[PDB]
Amino acid sequence: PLIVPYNLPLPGGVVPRMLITILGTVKPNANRIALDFQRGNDVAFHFNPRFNENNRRVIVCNTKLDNNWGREERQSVFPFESGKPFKIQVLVEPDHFKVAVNDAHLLQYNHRVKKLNEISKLGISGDIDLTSASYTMI
Ligand SMILES: Cc1nnc([C@@H]2O[C@H](CO)[C@H](O)[C@H](n3cc(-c4cc(F)c(Cl)c(F)c4)nn3)[C@H]2O)n1-c1cc(Cl)ccc1C(F)(F)F
Ligand SMILES: [Cl-]
């Protein structure tokens, strides 16, 4: 049981083969969740499940540079369920962030922010009970 919004420092930023694991439970009437990998004020990778966007569930991913959102990448495969425990794993690869939810591949997001060693914070927010947030090298 951790407080949301939650800040996970990523010391010296990220590097390929770094695996970030977030464990929590989706709240029973959830509307949205958001992971924000940040380079100072810029959002290198915003991962945002939306539970009711025009009565559809969709994963929206994007980057924010100089406070402007870029072109979104959308994924209709939606592995979250309100009220259930989840595990989100973000594997940093040389050209992409690879995301798997509950041990099933979900999507990949090409690096738009290229100074990986400056993406030094992961913000976790939205309609979840957060259990744990940590990282390791695979
Ligand atoms: C219109 C519209 N419809 N969605 C968005 C933005 O789309 C972005 C992806 O492109 C992010 O999801 C933004 N966002 C969502 C959240 C968040 C999520 C959570 F889950 C929580 Cl808990 C939380 F606190 C915060 N913070 N910023 C979201 O506001 N916009 C939007 C809104 C503005 Cl002010 C400016 C530009 C846009 C644009 F379309 F260009 F992207
Ligand atoms: Cl949103």
Side-chain angles (χ1 to χ4, degrees), residues 13-47:
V14 299
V15 66
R17 300 185 265 99
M18 182 168 179
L19 175 63
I20 300 105
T21 304
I22 300 101
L23 294 159
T25 303
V26 181
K27 292 267 197 71
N29 294 328
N31 185 53
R32 62 205 214 291
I33 299 165
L35 292 189
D36 285 283
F37 287 85
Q38 290 218 225
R39 171 171 174 256
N41 186 56
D42 288 344
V43 177
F45 173 43
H46 174 78
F47 169 84

PDB file of all heavy atoms in Angstrom, residues 13-47:
ATOM      1  N   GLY A  13      18.977   7.685 -14.899  1.00  0.00           N
ATOM      2  CA  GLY A  13      18.072   7.393 -15.996  1.00  0.00           C
ATOM      3  C   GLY A  13      17.954   5.927 -16.316  1.00  0.00           C
ATOM      4  O   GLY A  13      18.222   5.070 -15.467  1.00  0.00           O
ATOM      5  N   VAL A  14      17.526   5.632 -17.542  1.00  0.00           N
ATOM      6  CA  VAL A  14      17.315   4.237 -17.956  1.00  0.00           C
ATOM      7  C   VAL A  14      18.380   3.776 -18.916  1.00  0.00           C
ATOM      8  O   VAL A  14      19.113   4.578 -19.473  1.00  0.00           O
ATOM      9  CB  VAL A  14      15.896   4.001 -18.494  1.00  0.00           C
ATOM     10  CG1 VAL A  14      14.850   4.293 -17.422  1.00  0.00           C
ATOM     11  CG2 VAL A  14      15.609   4.797 -19.764  1.00  0.00           C
ATOM     12  N   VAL A  15      18.462   2.476 -19.107  1.00  0.00           N
ATOM     13  CA  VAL A  15      19.465   1.886 -19.979  1.00  0.00           C
ATOM     14  C   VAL A  15      18.867   0.600 -20.576  1.00  0.00           C
ATOM     15  O   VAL A  15      18.033  -0.025 -19.912  1.00  0.00           O
ATOM     16  CB  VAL A  15      20.754   1.643 -19.114  1.00  0.00           C
ATOM     17  CG1 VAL A  15      20.524   0.587 -18.017  1.00  0.00           C
ATOM     18  CG2 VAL A  15      21.942   1.278 -19.989  1.00  0.00           C
ATOM     19  N   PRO A  16      19.246   0.162 -21.790  1.00  0.00           N
ATOM     20  CA  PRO A  16      18.672  -1.093 -22.305  1.00  0.00           C
ATOM     21  C   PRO A  16      18.916  -2.283 -21.343  1.00  0.00           C
ATOM     22  O   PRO A  16      19.900  -2.281 -20.608  1.00  0.00           O
ATOM     23  CB  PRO A  16      19.352  -1.254 -23.670  1.00  0.00           C
ATOM     24  CG  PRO A  16      19.674   0.147 -24.082  1.00  0.00           C
ATOM     25  CD  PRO A  16      20.160   0.762 -22.785  1.00  0.00           C
ATOM     26  N   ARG A  17      17.952  -3.222 -21.270  1.00  0.00           N
ATOM     27  CA  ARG A  17      17.937  -4.391 -20.352  1.00  0.00           C
ATOM     28  C   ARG A  17      17.462  -4.028 -18.929  1.00  0.00           C
ATOM     29  O   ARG A  17      17.391  -4.915 -18.080  1.00  0.00           O
ATOM     30  CB  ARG A  17      19.279  -5.174 -20.318  1.00  0.00           C
ATOM     31  CG  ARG A  17      19.658  -5.713 -21.693  1.00  0.00           C
ATOM     32  CD  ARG A  17      20.905  -6.568 -21.647  1.00  0.00           C
ATOM     33  NE  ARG A  17      22.112  -5.797 -21.967  1.00  0.00           N
ATOM     34  CZ  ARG A  17      22.987  -5.289 -21.095  1.00  0.00           C
ATOM     35  NH1 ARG A  17      22.810  -5.451 -19.783  1.00  0.00           N
ATOM     36  NH2 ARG A  17      24.046  -4.611 -21.526  1.00  0.00           N
ATOM     37  N   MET A  18      17.039  -2.780 -18.688  1.00  0.00           N
ATOM     38  CA  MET A  18      16.495  -2.385 -17.371  1.00  0.00           C
ATOM     39  C   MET A  18      15.006  -2.741 -17.402  1.00  0.00           C
ATOM     40  O   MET A  18      14.315  -2.350 -18.335  1.00  0.00           O
ATOM     41  CB  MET A  18      16.637  -0.865 -17.164  1.00  0.00           C
ATOM     42  CG  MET A  18      16.131  -0.361 -15.798  1.00  0.00           C
ATOM     43  SD  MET A  18      16.688   1.351 -15.546  1.00  0.00           S
ATOM     44  CE  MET A  18      15.953   1.759 -13.901  1.00  0.00           C
ATOM     45  N   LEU A  19      14.513  -3.443 -16.381  1.00  0.00           N
ATOM     46  CA  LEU A  19      13.130  -3.888 -16.341  1.00  0.00           C
ATOM     47  C   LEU A  19      12.437  -3.211 -15.187  1.00  0.00           C
ATOM     48  O   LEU A  19      12.852  -3.402 -14.054  1.00  0.00           O
ATOM     49  CB  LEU A  19      13.122  -5.415 -16.172  1.00  0.00           C
ATOM     50  CG  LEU A  19      11.741  -6.066 -15.980  1.00  0.00           C
ATOM     51  CD1 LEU A  19      10.864  -5.842 -17.234  1.00  0.00           C
ATOM     52  CD2 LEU A  19      11.889  -7.567 -15.665  1.00  0.00           C
ATOM     53  N   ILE A  20      11.426  -2.379 -15.452  1.00  0.00           N
ATOM     54  CA  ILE A  20      10.705  -1.692 -14.384  1.00  0.00           C
ATOM     55  C   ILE A  20       9.408  -2.479 -14.171  1.00  0.00           C
ATOM     56  O   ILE A  20       8.701  -2.727 -15.150  1.00  0.00           O
ATOM     57  CB  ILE A  20      10.463  -0.208 -14.760  1.00  0.00           C
ATOM     58  CG1 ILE A  20      11.820   0.530 -14.998  1.00  0.00           C
ATOM     59  CG2 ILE A  20       9.644   0.500 -13.679  1.00  0.00           C
ATOM     60  CD1 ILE A  20      12.137   0.795 -16.381  1.00  0.00           C
ATOM     61  N   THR A  21       9.106  -2.879 -12.912  1.00  0.00           N
ATOM     62  CA  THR A  21       7.901  -3.651 -12.578  1.00  0.00           C
ATOM     63  C   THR A  21       7.008  -2.858 -11.597  1.00  0.00           C
ATOM     64  O   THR A  21       7.471  -2.469 -10.511  1.00  0.00           O
ATOM     65  CB  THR A  21       8.290  -5.018 -11.996  1.00  0.00           C
ATOM     66  OG1 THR A  21       9.134  -5.684 -12.933  1.00  0.00           O
ATOM     67  CG2 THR A  21       7.074  -5.902 -11.676  1.00  0.00           C
ATOM     68  N   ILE A  22       5.740  -2.621 -11.987  1.00  0.00           N
ATOM     69  CA  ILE A  22       4.762  -1.914 -11.158  1.00  0.00           C
ATOM     70  C   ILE A  22       3.692  -2.944 -10.800  1.00  0.00           C
ATOM     71  O   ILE A  22       3.098  -3.511 -11.708  1.00  0.00           O
ATOM     72  CB  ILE A  22       4.145  -0.714 -11.934  1.00  0.00           C
ATOM     73  CG1 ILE A  22       5.233   0.309 -12.357  1.00  0.00           C
ATOM     74  CG2 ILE A  22       3.035  -0.005 -11.119  1.00  0.00           C
ATOM     75  CD1 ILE A  22       5.668   0.218 -13.811  1.00  0.00           C
ATOM     76  N   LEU A  23       3.423  -3.149  -9.503  1.00  0.00           N
ATOM     77  CA  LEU A  23       2.379  -4.074  -9.016  1.00  0.00           C
ATOM     78  C   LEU A  23       1.346  -3.253  -8.282  1.00  0.00           C
ATOM     79  O   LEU A  23       1.692  -2.419  -7.429  1.00  0.00           O
ATOM     80  CB  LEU A  23       2.947  -5.118  -8.033  1.00  0.00           C
ATOM     81  CG  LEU A  23       3.949  -6.112  -8.630  1.00  0.00           C
ATOM     82  CD1 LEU A  23       4.837  -6.741  -7.534  1.00  0.00           C
ATOM     83  CD2 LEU A  23       3.231  -7.206  -9.362  1.00  0.00           C
ATOM     84  N   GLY A  24       0.083  -3.521  -8.574  1.00  0.00           N
ATOM     85  CA  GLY A  24      -1.023  -2.842  -7.925  1.00  0.00           C
ATOM     86  C   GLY A  24      -2.336  -3.545  -8.202  1.00  0.00           C
ATOM     87  O   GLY A  24      -2.351  -4.656  -8.745  1.00  0.00           O
ATOM     88  N   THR A  25      -3.431  -2.896  -7.843  1.00  0.00           N
ATOM     89  CA  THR A  25      -4.796  -3.374  -8.111  1.00  0.00           C
ATOM     90  C   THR A  25      -5.543  -2.232  -8.772  1.00  0.00           C
ATOM     91  O   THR A  25      -5.439  -1.089  -8.324  1.00  0.00           O
ATOM     92  CB  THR A  25      -5.456  -3.866  -6.810  1.00  0.00           C
ATOM     93  OG1 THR A  25      -4.642  -4.887  -6.249  1.00  0.00           O
ATOM     94  CG2 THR A  25      -6.862  -4.451  -7.022  1.00  0.00           C
ATOM     95  N   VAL A  26      -6.293  -2.514  -9.850  1.00  0.00           N
ATOM     96  CA  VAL A  26      -7.113  -1.470 -10.453  1.00  0.00           C
ATOM     97  C   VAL A  26      -8.299  -1.252  -9.520  1.00  0.00           C
ATOM     98  O   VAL A  26      -8.883  -2.240  -9.055  1.00  0.00           O
ATOM     99  CB  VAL A  26      -7.581  -1.832 -11.877  1.00  0.00           C
ATOM    100  CG1 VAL A  26      -8.419  -0.710 -12.474  1.00  0.00           C
ATOM    101  CG2 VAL A  26      -6.375  -2.115 -12.783  1.00  0.00           C
ATOM    102  N   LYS A  27      -8.696   0.021  -9.283  1.00  0.00           N
ATOM    103  CA  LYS A  27      -9.853   0.326  -8.413  1.00  0.00           C
ATOM    104  C   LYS A  27     -11.145  -0.209  -9.056  1.00  0.00           C
ATOM    105  O   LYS A  27     -11.218  -0.294 -10.276  1.00  0.00           O
ATOM    106  CB  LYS A  27      -9.999   1.851  -8.191  1.00  0.00           C
ATOM    107  CG  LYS A  27      -8.885   2.467  -7.363  1.00  0.00           C
ATOM    108  CD  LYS A  27      -9.206   2.532  -5.871  1.00  0.00           C
ATOM    109  CE  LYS A  27      -8.310   3.492  -5.123  1.00  0.00           C
ATOM    110  NZ  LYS A  27      -8.594   4.919  -5.452  1.00  0.00           N
ATOM    111  N   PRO A  28     -12.193  -0.528  -8.269  1.00  0.00           N
ATOM    112  CA  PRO A  28     -13.416  -1.096  -8.875  1.00  0.00           C
ATOM    113  C   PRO A  28     -14.160  -0.219  -9.895  1.00  0.00           C
ATOM    114  O   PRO A  28     -14.798  -0.782 -10.769  1.00  0.00           O
ATOM    115  CB  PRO A  28     -14.304  -1.445  -7.665  1.00  0.00           C
ATOM    116  CG  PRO A  28     -13.698  -0.759  -6.501  1.00  0.00           C
ATOM    117  CD  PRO A  28     -12.251  -0.544  -6.792  1.00  0.00           C
ATOM    118  N   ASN A  29     -14.105   1.106  -9.833  1.00  0.00           N
ATOM    119  CA  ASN A  29     -14.817   1.905 -10.852  1.00  0.00           C
ATOM    120  C   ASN A  29     -13.837   2.765 -11.652  1.00  0.00           C
ATOM    121  O   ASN A  29     -14.167   3.887 -12.033  1.00  0.00           O
ATOM    122  CB  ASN A  29     -15.899   2.755 -10.174  1.00  0.00           C
ATOM    123  CG  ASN A  29     -17.009   1.925  -9.575  1.00  0.00           C
ATOM    124  OD1 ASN A  29     -17.357   0.854 -10.085  1.00  0.00           O
ATOM    125  ND2 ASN A  29     -17.629   2.420  -8.511  1.00  0.00           N
ATOM    126  N   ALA A  30     -12.624   2.222 -11.931  1.00  0.00           N
ATOM    127  CA  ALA A  30     -11.537   2.967 -12.581  1.00  0.00           C
ATOM    128  C   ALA A  30     -11.919   3.649 -13.882  1.00  0.00           C
ATOM    129  O   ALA A  30     -12.651   3.080 -14.670  1.00  0.00           O
ATOM    130  CB  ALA A  30     -10.330   2.055 -12.818  1.00  0.00           C
ATOM    131  N   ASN A  31     -11.416   4.877 -14.091  1.00  0.00           N
ATOM    132  CA  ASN A  31     -11.579   5.637 -15.337  1.00  0.00           C
ATOM    133  C   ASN A  31     -10.218   5.706 -16.097  1.00  0.00           C
ATOM    134  O   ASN A  31     -10.198   5.610 -17.326  1.00  0.00           O
ATOM    135  CB  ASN A  31     -12.060   7.065 -15.010  1.00  0.00           C
ATOM    136  CG  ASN A  31     -12.368   7.912 -16.230  1.00  0.00           C
ATOM    137  OD1 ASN A  31     -13.135   7.513 -17.113  1.00  0.00           O
ATOM    138  ND2 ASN A  31     -11.834   9.129 -16.287  1.00  0.00           N
ATOM    139  N   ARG A  32      -9.090   5.843 -15.379  1.00  0.00           N
ATOM    140  CA  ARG A  32      -7.781   5.940 -16.035  1.00  0.00           C
ATOM    141  C   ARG A  32      -6.610   5.624 -15.125  1.00  0.00           C
ATOM    142  O   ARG A  32      -6.723   5.711 -13.895  1.00  0.00           O
ATOM    143  CB  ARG A  32      -7.591   7.373 -16.547  1.00  0.00           C
ATOM    144  CG  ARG A  32      -7.590   8.419 -15.419  1.00  0.00           C
ATOM    145  CD  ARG A  32      -8.004   9.792 -15.912  1.00  0.00           C
ATOM    146  NE  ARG A  32      -7.332  10.909 -15.242  1.00  0.00           N
ATOM    147  CZ  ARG A  32      -7.509  11.288 -13.976  1.00  0.00           C
ATOM    148  NH1 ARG A  32      -8.314  10.598 -13.169  1.00  0.00           N
ATOM    149  NH2 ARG A  32      -6.861  12.343 -13.497  1.00  0.00           N
ATOM    150  N   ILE A  33      -5.483   5.263 -15.743  1.00  0.00           N
ATOM    151  CA  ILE A  33      -4.201   5.002 -15.070  1.00  0.00           C
ATOM    152  C   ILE A  33      -3.168   5.729 -15.910  1.00  0.00           C
ATOM    153  O   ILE A  33      -3.382   5.892 -17.107  1.00  0.00           O
ATOM    154  CB  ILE A  33      -3.889   3.475 -15.023  1.00  0.00           C
ATOM    155  CG1 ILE A  33      -4.961   2.708 -14.235  1.00  0.00           C
ATOM    156  CG2 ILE A  33      -2.467   3.218 -14.459  1.00  0.00           C
ATOM    157  CD1 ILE A  33      -4.916   1.181 -14.466  1.00  0.00           C
ATOM    158  N   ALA A  34      -2.040   6.121 -15.329  1.00  0.00           N
ATOM    159  CA  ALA A  34      -0.989   6.737 -16.121  1.00  0.00           C
ATOM    160  C   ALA A  34       0.390   6.493 -15.516  1.00  0.00           C
ATOM    161  O   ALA A  34       0.572   6.675 -14.318  1.00  0.00           O
ATOM    162  CB  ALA A  34      -1.242   8.224 -16.271  1.00  0.00           C
ATOM    163  N   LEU A  35       1.322   6.036 -16.342  1.00  0.00           N
ATOM    164  CA  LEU A  35       2.748   5.926 -16.031  1.00  0.00           C
ATOM    165  C   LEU A  35       3.396   7.041 -16.831  1.00  0.00           C
ATOM    166  O   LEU A  35       3.114   7.157 -18.026  1.00  0.00           O
ATOM    167  CB  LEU A  35       3.351   4.598 -16.514  1.00  0.00           C
ATOM    168  CG  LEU A  35       2.894   3.329 -15.815  1.00  0.00           C
ATOM    169  CD1 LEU A  35       3.750   2.136 -16.247  1.00  0.00           C
ATOM    170  CD2 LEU A  35       2.956   3.478 -14.341  1.00  0.00           C
ATOM    171  N   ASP A  36       4.238   7.864 -16.197  1.00  0.00           N
ATOM    172  CA  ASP A  36       4.939   8.963 -16.887  1.00  0.00           C
ATOM    173  C   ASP A  36       6.428   8.833 -16.661  1.00  0.00           C
ATOM    174  O   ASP A  36       6.890   9.164 -15.569  1.00  0.00           O
ATOM    175  CB  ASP A  36       4.461  10.332 -16.371  1.00  0.00           C
ATOM    176  CG  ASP A  36       3.095  10.713 -16.903  1.00  0.00           C
ATOM    177  OD1 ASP A  36       3.009  11.128 -18.076  1.00  0.00           O
ATOM    178  OD2 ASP A  36       2.100  10.543 -16.169  1.00  0.00           O
ATOM    179  N   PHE A  37       7.188   8.377 -17.685  1.00  0.00           N
ATOM    180  CA  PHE A  37       8.657   8.330 -17.614  1.00  0.00           C
ATOM    181  C   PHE A  37       9.121   9.713 -17.997  1.00  0.00           C
ATOM    182  O   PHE A  37       8.908  10.128 -19.149  1.00  0.00           O
ATOM    183  CB  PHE A  37       9.233   7.310 -18.598  1.00  0.00           C
ATOM    184  CG  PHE A  37       8.993   5.903 -18.137  1.00  0.00           C
ATOM    185  CD1 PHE A  37       7.800   5.254 -18.429  1.00  0.00           C
ATOM    186  CD2 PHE A  37       9.953   5.231 -17.377  1.00  0.00           C
ATOM    187  CE1 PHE A  37       7.576   3.952 -17.992  1.00  0.00           C
ATOM    188  CE2 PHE A  37       9.733   3.932 -16.952  1.00  0.00           C
ATOM    189  CZ  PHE A  37       8.538   3.304 -17.247  1.00  0.00           C
ATOM    190  N   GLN A  38       9.768  10.426 -17.056  1.00  0.00           N
ATOM    191  CA  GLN A  38      10.108  11.839 -17.240  1.00  0.00           C
ATOM    192  C   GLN A  38      11.588  12.178 -17.388  1.00  0.00           C
ATOM    193  O   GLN A  38      12.408  11.623 -16.680  1.00  0.00           O
ATOM    194  CB  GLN A  38       9.521  12.628 -16.038  1.00  0.00           C
ATOM    195  CG  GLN A  38       7.964  12.660 -16.116  1.00  0.00           C
ATOM    196  CD  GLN A  38       7.267  13.944 -15.692  1.00  0.00           C
ATOM    197  OE1 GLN A  38       6.271  13.885 -14.968  1.00  0.00           O
ATOM    198  NE2 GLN A  38       7.685  15.127 -16.189  1.00  0.00           N
ATOM    199  N   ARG A  39      11.902  13.123 -18.279  1.00  0.00           N
ATOM    200  CA  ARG A  39      13.246  13.686 -18.445  1.00  0.00           C
ATOM    201  C   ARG A  39      13.044  15.147 -18.032  1.00  0.00           C
ATOM    202  O   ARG A  39      12.631  15.981 -18.844  1.00  0.00           O
ATOM    203  CB  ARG A  39      13.764  13.546 -19.896  1.00  0.00           C
ATOM    204  CG  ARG A  39      15.070  14.335 -20.122  1.00  0.00           C
ATOM    205  CD  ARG A  39      15.747  14.076 -21.455  1.00  0.00           C
ATOM    206  NE  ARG A  39      16.892  14.995 -21.614  1.00  0.00           N
ATOM    207  CZ  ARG A  39      16.956  16.081 -22.379  1.00  0.00           C
ATOM    208  NH1 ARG A  39      15.924  16.434 -23.143  1.00  0.00           N
ATOM    209  NH2 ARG A  39      18.059  16.819 -22.399  1.00  0.00           N
ATOM    210  N   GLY A  40      13.221  15.426 -16.743  1.00  0.00           N
ATOM    211  CA  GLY A  40      12.939  16.762 -16.235  1.00  0.00           C
ATOM    212  C   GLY A  40      11.453  17.007 -16.419  1.00  0.00           C
ATOM    213  O   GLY A  40      10.632  16.135 -16.087  1.00  0.00           O
ATOM    214  N   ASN A  41      11.092  18.112 -17.084  1.00  0.00           N
ATOM    215  CA  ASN A  41       9.686  18.391 -17.382  1.00  0.00           C
ATOM    216  C   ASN A  41       9.142  17.600 -18.603  1.00  0.00           C
ATOM    217  O   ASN A  41       7.936  17.521 -18.767  1.00  0.00           O
ATOM    218  CB  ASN A  41       9.479  19.889 -17.645  1.00  0.00           C
ATOM    219  CG  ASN A  41       8.024  20.217 -17.821  1.00  0.00           C
ATOM    220  OD1 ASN A  41       7.210  19.920 -16.954  1.00  0.00           O
ATOM    221  ND2 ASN A  41       7.645  20.771 -18.950  1.00  0.00           N
ATOM    222  N   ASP A  42       9.987  17.090 -19.489  1.00  0.00           N
ATOM    223  CA  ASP A  42       9.467  16.359 -20.641  1.00  0.00           C
ATOM    224  C   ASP A  42       8.990  14.960 -20.245  1.00  0.00           C
ATOM    225  O   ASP A  42       9.532  14.379 -19.300  1.00  0.00           O
ATOM    226  CB  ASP A  42      10.531  16.251 -21.741  1.00  0.00           C
ATOM    227  CG  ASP A  42      10.809  17.561 -22.455  1.00  0.00           C
ATOM    228  OD1 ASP A  42       9.978  18.505 -22.330  1.00  0.00           O
ATOM    229  OD2 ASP A  42      11.805  17.623 -23.203  1.00  0.00           O
ATOM    230  N   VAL A  43       7.967  14.435 -20.950  1.00  0.00           N
ATOM    231  CA  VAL A  43       7.488  13.079 -20.684  1.00  0.00           C
ATOM    232  C   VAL A  43       7.998  12.242 -21.836  1.00  0.00           C
ATOM    233  O   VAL A  43       7.484  12.362 -22.944  1.00  0.00           O
ATOM    234  CB  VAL A  43       5.961  12.948 -20.513  1.00  0.00           C
ATOM    235  CG1 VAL A  43       5.585  11.476 -20.307  1.00  0.00           C
ATOM    236  CG2 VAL A  43       5.478  13.795 -19.329  1.00  0.00           C
ATOM    237  N   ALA A  44       9.050  11.474 -21.607  1.00  0.00           N
ATOM    238  CA  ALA A  44       9.604  10.604 -22.659  1.00  0.00           C
ATOM    239  C   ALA A  44       8.601   9.546 -23.067  1.00  0.00           C
ATOM    240  O   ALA A  44       8.474   9.250 -24.253  1.00  0.00           O
ATOM    241  CB  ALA A  44      10.861   9.921 -22.163  1.00  0.00           C
ATOM    242  N   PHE A  45       7.900   8.954 -22.091  1.00  0.00           N
ATOM    243  CA  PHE A  45       6.931   7.900 -22.395  1.00  0.00           C
ATOM    244  C   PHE A  45       5.792   7.977 -21.404  1.00  0.00           C
ATOM    245  O   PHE A  45       5.996   7.760 -20.215  1.00  0.00           O
ATOM    246  CB  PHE A  45       7.609   6.523 -22.382  1.00  0.00           C
ATOM    247  CG  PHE A  45       6.706   5.301 -22.517  1.00  0.00           C
ATOM    248  CD1 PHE A  45       5.661   5.282 -23.435  1.00  0.00           C
ATOM    249  CD2 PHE A  45       6.994   4.124 -21.834  1.00  0.00           C
ATOM    250  CE1 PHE A  45       4.866   4.144 -23.589  1.00  0.00           C
ATOM    251  CE2 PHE A  45       6.212   2.973 -22.014  1.00  0.00           C
ATOM    252  CZ  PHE A  45       5.149   2.992 -22.884  1.00  0.00           C
ATOM    253  N   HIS A  46       4.593   8.338 -21.912  1.00  0.00           N
ATOM    254  CA  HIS A  46       3.340   8.462 -21.177  1.00  0.00           C
ATOM    255  C   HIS A  46       2.525   7.235 -21.581  1.00  0.00           C
ATOM    256  O   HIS A  46       2.301   7.070 -22.772  1.00  0.00           O
ATOM    257  CB  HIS A  46       2.599   9.723 -21.626  1.00  0.00           C
ATOM    258  CG  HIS A  46       1.231   9.869 -21.042  1.00  0.00           C
ATOM    259  ND1 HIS A  46       1.055  10.312 -19.752  1.00  0.00           N
ATOM    260  CD2 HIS A  46       0.018   9.772 -21.644  1.00  0.00           C
ATOM    261  CE1 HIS A  46      -0.259  10.432 -19.577  1.00  0.00           C
ATOM    262  NE2 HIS A  46      -0.926  10.120 -20.689  1.00  0.00           N
ATOM    263  N   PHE A  47       2.166   6.357 -20.638  1.00  0.00           N
ATOM    264  CA  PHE A  47       1.432   5.104 -20.917  1.00  0.00           C
ATOM    265  C   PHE A  47       0.131   5.258 -20.208  1.00  0.00           C
ATOM    266  O   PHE A  47       0.130   5.314 -18.991  1.00  0.00           O
ATOM    267  CB  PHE A  47       2.238   3.920 -20.369  1.00  0.00           C
ATOM    268  CG  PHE A  47       1.506   2.604 -20.333  1.00  0.00           C
ATOM    269  CD1 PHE A  47       1.452   1.792 -21.459  1.00  0.00           C
ATOM    270  CD2 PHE A  47       0.831   2.193 -19.185  1.00  0.00           C
ATOM    271  CE1 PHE A  47       0.800   0.561 -21.421  1.00  0.00           C
ATOM    272  CE2 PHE A  47       0.147   0.972 -19.160  1.00  0.00           C
ATOM    273  CZ  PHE A  47       0.159   0.155 -20.271  1.00  0.00           C
TER     274      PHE A  47
END
